[PDB]
Every structure is written in structure tokens, then in C-alpha cells.
């Protein structure tokens, strides 16, 4: 259907300005969905190499538009603070028997730098799943309010594809051109910070931004 027309409508054989592409992105209004985005960027890194694998977290002015339920696996006197600071799933490390069984999914894995005795599944059943984060990523630290604030603001984590591709969300099209430009610039500068020790070619081989149903337009 609408694909069999937007394929004719698109002219994705060129490289577009970041603000000359927002008009083409908004042109997709003829499609029916919630129209979130899946902005993807490349890198001059070899995912076979450990020292070139790129991972981290960011903070953006607006958010993803979806609530991410973050956990806090450090119970005790800090359990009340974790629950009242923005812990959508208040399950302590010693309280992971029942809340963990009840909640089969969430937004952000627990991050408790002052108490992280829990391992999880004994075989990477949670770390391998990606939800289980590490303190160096930015989740586990002495502060507890940091994780709650990141969950509320929808801080997104970078994941390195097999070919060095990094994918991220900005939200639905109800965000405006200026908001989109701000978020993509934040992502680009974060990638500039997180460029590894090897800088081959261009740190952004290609950058494209697309909706959940529509086309993907290069941002150059």
C-alpha cells in the first residue's frame, strides 16, 4: 500500500542536509502509525576489535516519549529513597525474589553502585539480554537519583551492531524540527566524544533517520 507510493515519492539517491531532510521526513504524514523514529549512524570501527566497540548512555532534552521502568537492586534503608526517587519497579537486591518474578520486563536494568551484590541468572541471563547494565555505562554509582532521573528522561544507551552501526530513538513526529535537530546534534556530539582510539575514514560513514513505517533519509 502506502509503501508502493512512498517508494515513488522518495529520492534517497542523494545526501540531504539535516534541515533539508526534516521537510521530507514530515512529508510522510500520509502513513498510519505512531511514527516513532529509528535514527541509525555508522562508524569507522571494527566490531571484531574490542578496543573499537562503542557503548554508553546519553541525555537528551526531550526523551523517547515512552516511560522506561528502571530497577534498583540495592534494598535496605535506601529502598524507600529508590522507590520515591523514580523507581518504577522497587525491588531490592534482597527483594529480588518476588518483584523479579512478577516483573518479566522493564526499561532500564538496576544500577546501584553502593550495593550490587546481585549477579543475575548465573549465566548472563540478564547481562546477555542487555538489560543488565554495568556501572561504567552510567547506571551503577554512589548516587541513586541518577538512575531515576535517567529513566524519567529516557536516557538512551548506545549499542554496537556487528558492523559498527549504532541505532537510537528520538520519538514520534509530534516533535518539531528544532527539537529533532537538537536531539540529533546531541547524538552526533556524543558520538564525537565516544570515537575510539582508531579514527579511520569518517566517524560517520552514513547517518540516516527514518520512521517506524516510512522511508529512511540520509542526513549528511
Amino acid at each position: 500500500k502506502r509503501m508502493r507510493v512512498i517508494r515513488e515519492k522518495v529520492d534517497a539517491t542523494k545526501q540531504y542536509d539535516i534541515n533539508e531532510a526534516i521537510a521530507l521526513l514530515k512529508e510522510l504524514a500520509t502513513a498510519k502509525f505512531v511514527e516513532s523514529v529509528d535514527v541509525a549512524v555508522n562508524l569507522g570501527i571494527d566490531a571484531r576489535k574490542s578496543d573499537q566497540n562503542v557503548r554508553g548512555a546519553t541525555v537528551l532534552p526531550h526523551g523517547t516519549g515512552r516511560s522506561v521502568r528502571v530497577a534498583v537492586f540495592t534494598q535496605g534503608a535506601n529502598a524507600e529513597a529508590a522507590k520515591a526517587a523514580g523507581a518504577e519497579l522497587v525491588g531490592m537486591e534482597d527483594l529480588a525474589d518476588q518483584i523479579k518474578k512478577g516483573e518479566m520486563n522493564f526499561d532500564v536494568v538496576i544500577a546501584s553502585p553502593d550495593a550490587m551484590r546481585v549477579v543475575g541468572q548465573l549465566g548472563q541471563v540478564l547481562g546477555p539480554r542487555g538489560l543488565m547494565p554495568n556501572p561504567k555505562v552510567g547506571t551503577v554509582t554512589p548516587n541513586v537519583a541518577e538512575a531515576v532521573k535517567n529513566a524519567k528522561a529516557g536516557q538512551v544507551r548506545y549499542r554496537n551492531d556487528k558492523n559498527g552501526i549504532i541505532h537510537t530513538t528520538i520519538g514520534k513526529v509530534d516533535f518539531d524540527a528544532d527539537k529533532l535537530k537538537e536531539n540529533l546534534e546531541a547524538l552526533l556530539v556524543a558520538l564525537k566524544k565516544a570515537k575510539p582510539t582508531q579514527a579511520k575514514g569518517v566517524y560517520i560513514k552514513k547517518v540516516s533517520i527514518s520512521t517506524t513505517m516510512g522511508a529512511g533519509v540520509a542526513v549528511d
Binding site: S50, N53, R55, S112, R117, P135, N160
Partner: protein, 551 residues
Amino acid sequence: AQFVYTMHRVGKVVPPKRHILKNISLSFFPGAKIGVLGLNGAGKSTLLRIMAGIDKDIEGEARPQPDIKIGYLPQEPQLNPEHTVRESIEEAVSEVVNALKRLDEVYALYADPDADFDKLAAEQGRLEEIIQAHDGHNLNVQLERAADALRLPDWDAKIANLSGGERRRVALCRLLLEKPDMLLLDQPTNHLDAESVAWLERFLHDFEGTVVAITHDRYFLDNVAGWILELDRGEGIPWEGNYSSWLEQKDQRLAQEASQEAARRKSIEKELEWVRQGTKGRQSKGKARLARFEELNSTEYQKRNETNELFIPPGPRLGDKVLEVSNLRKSYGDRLLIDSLSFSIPKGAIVGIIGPNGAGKSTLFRMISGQEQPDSGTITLGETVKLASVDQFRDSMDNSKTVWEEVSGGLDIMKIGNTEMPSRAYVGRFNFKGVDQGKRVGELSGGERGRLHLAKLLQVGGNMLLLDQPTNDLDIETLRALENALLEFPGCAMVISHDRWFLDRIATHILDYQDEGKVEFFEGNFTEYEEYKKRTLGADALEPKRIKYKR
């Protein structure tokens, strides 16, 4: 098309002054498949040891492209006898396992605040990066998939208590788990059975990277290789084509070389006749012609071709009762290899023992030689029988000793049954016909190792032979010589092998292993064995599945 590997003017010199490789200039391009041919001693394993970076002594320049991984499998894959199957396997993924253990150690940080963040949490990122470079967490599944695809033994099994074929499979799995871009294989089908070889050759055909494989066989080579590197005495000769066309080209090359050498002999004799004349007056004679004759008197390298000299000494006279087994049965733990096997060996017979890997082929030889004790007993030999046994593994010779010392033990006269034989003559009967007596056992090549093994183990003079994979590293020439020697044998022999053609050209009784530990015995050769199967056959033809490696 950027190459993958390059050699320019690559040359190697061995003890004294012998140019095994002289001026080998070659380039290796992506997706290539090369089969390296040659006799037993040509320099194939040398060239692959150079290509692996292990040997830098060479003259010239050999180098791969940067950031391309070379997986080198030699033709002597070594493994840790203490290690079990998993203890040997994980070394191919050791980075992920070591990093995971370090993560386990690090996770006590968030328990106890001792040197909390600025000292090890940052390095936790490097550890998670080394995990990320691979799958890391989904690693047990990777290991299980590799074991399933390669039909590995269960991880609880040790490495010393492993059959040669499964040992080679373990080496193959540990090599391919590294996931390289250029495979160097030094006889990768040394101890493999039919299904394992077929799977390996299909995998090699599917392999995206470059493959350089040394093989003395022809059918697997026709399967895998894209072109051939002949690697004659000194010089490497590329070739596009199949094994039979390459063979034809090789005979033409050798015939032309023989003709040119004969013409050289003719011309040298003529010019010597001229040199041996007088001046006849006060005239020239001439120094230019003298110089031409002196430079014409040069040296040419004869082929060190083994050919038909493999000396199997005749044993004592053999009566009609040679060997008999009754209801033989053997099991290990819960898996049973031989169950209710009975058969008698008439004199003069060659028994081709065939079957899959670790089916019990070598353990049968252990029982016959008396080093193992069967559960159901009743193994017997005639009183005239004298046993000479050749093992599947060459790990019994002192690599320090020379060829002559190791074969003969230092005694100038060698006793073989009734007749005393000169040790040097006996050793030279096995193609060590020159100063090759002085070479060291460790410095010998794989095929020369097999030849020396046969020479050392046939001297006992038994009229019953128990040969276990006797043609492992041998080429076609030594293989044919051994086949002829086996045919001209008065006694009887039992040969375990995986070469169907070699077994078919000599076997008179087939002893074939099957599933559930049944060892079918068939008196006859392979032609009539196949005819019997066709006479009473089953309706299907599809063995393999060709599972996978990736994902």
C-alpha cells in the same frame, strides 16, 4: 583486487646448502583456494610455516595484509594430555572466559567499597568491550553448536583417552573457533573418516576467506582447491585445473626434464672427448671452449622419489591357524565398541579394517597385541604367529637421534629373524639412500616420519602385521610402494585405514565397524563387499546434513 598474502623472492636453506624453496614469488587473493602438492620432503610444511609467520629465517619477503587473521593448523597438532575435551577446547575462546571470570571477581566491588570506582570500574568497560567484540555471554551455545557440527566427543572426556580422528577434530574445532580470514591447513584430513572429511570439504568450499591446504590426496583436492601449487624440488609451479590434468602436466614436465638431462649428458661426453685430445701443432685448442665445458659441468637435482623399495621382511613360516576371536566384546563406561564379534583369519590374508572414528579399530589392535583385555575374551593366535605392530601415533621415537640410530639402534649389523642385515643397507631400503641417514628424527618431515616409523617397526620380522593407518603422511608414490610390498608378503596383515582406494587395492577380508558396536566381518574384497550389499541392500542414499558454524 588487493591480495591477502604475498611472497617475493622467498627462499629457504636447510642444513648444508639445500634450497628447499628458491625464488617463490606469489600472491594470495581473497576467496582463493590453493592446494599445495609435492613429494614427502618437498617443503610444503616449510612453506606453510613461513606463511604462518612462525618461520622468519627465510630469504626474501613474505607478509600478509594487516588485520587479517591466519589460522594455522600444522600436521602435528599438539594437545594437553591433562586437559579434558572442554579443558582443551575453551583455549580457543579463552579471552571471553577469562574476561567473564574477571567480571565475576570485579562484581564484589559493589559489595565492598575498597578502591571503588576510579581504579577498576573504568577497566570494567574494557572487559565488557572484549566481551562485546564477540558474543561473549552466549558462549555455551556457541560451544555446543561447534561440538554438534563437528561431532566432537563429550566435554567430560579426556584428551589422552581420545582416538586420533577425534583428536584431529578437536584441533580443527579449536582452530576454527578463532574465526580467521586465511586458513593454512597441513594435511587437514590426516585421521578423518568419510563423513568428517566430506563435512570439512563442504565447509572449506563455503569458507569466505582464503584457504591454503596441503594434501597428498586427490579427491578432496578436486573438491576444495581452486588452483594447485606443485612445489617441486626448489621451485613452486602454479596450475589451474584438476588433479588428473595437473598429473598429465607433471609427467610432461618430468619427461622434458629427463630429455634435457640426457642431452646434457650427451653434450658433456662429446666435449670431454674434445678436451681429451692433443693440440695438433702450435694451434689454438682454445680457452673459451674450455671455459664453456667447465661451466657446462654443473649439478642437477634428481627427484628424491620413494618408489618401490619399501622393504617388508619375510617373517617365519605361517601355519593355517593364524588368529581367531570368539564373541569378542568390549565397552568403555556406557558406550560399547565391540559386541559379540567372532572371526578367523586364514593365512596370507590382508584384512582391511574400516569404520568411523573411535569405533574401536585401534582398540582391536590393542587386544590382538595383548595390551588390552577384552570383556568376553577368546582372542587367540597360532603358535607360529609372530606379531609386528605399527601404531596410529608416531609418538614413540626419540626426536634427538638420527635416522640411522633410531631405526637401527646403533648396531652396524641388524638382526631380522634368521638373517643378519647391514643396518645402513636396511635403512637405505626405505629411501634413506644417501646422507639422509644423518638427519634427525625431529628434523624429519611427516612423510619421512611415517617411512622411518615403518622401517623401525617392520624390523621385528613378524609374519602377522598389525598396521594402524600406515599411509597417514605418505604420498601416492610411497603409498604405491607400500601397496606393492604388502602384496608381496608371505604372511598375513591387518590394516586399518581410511583410504578406500588403498584398502581396496590390497584387502582380501573386510572387517567393517557399524553402529551399536557390531563389527561386520566379510571374507572378500571391496568389490564383492559392495556387490553383497547391493544383493541385500536398503533403499536410500543420503548420509550428511552439513549443519553450520556461524550463528
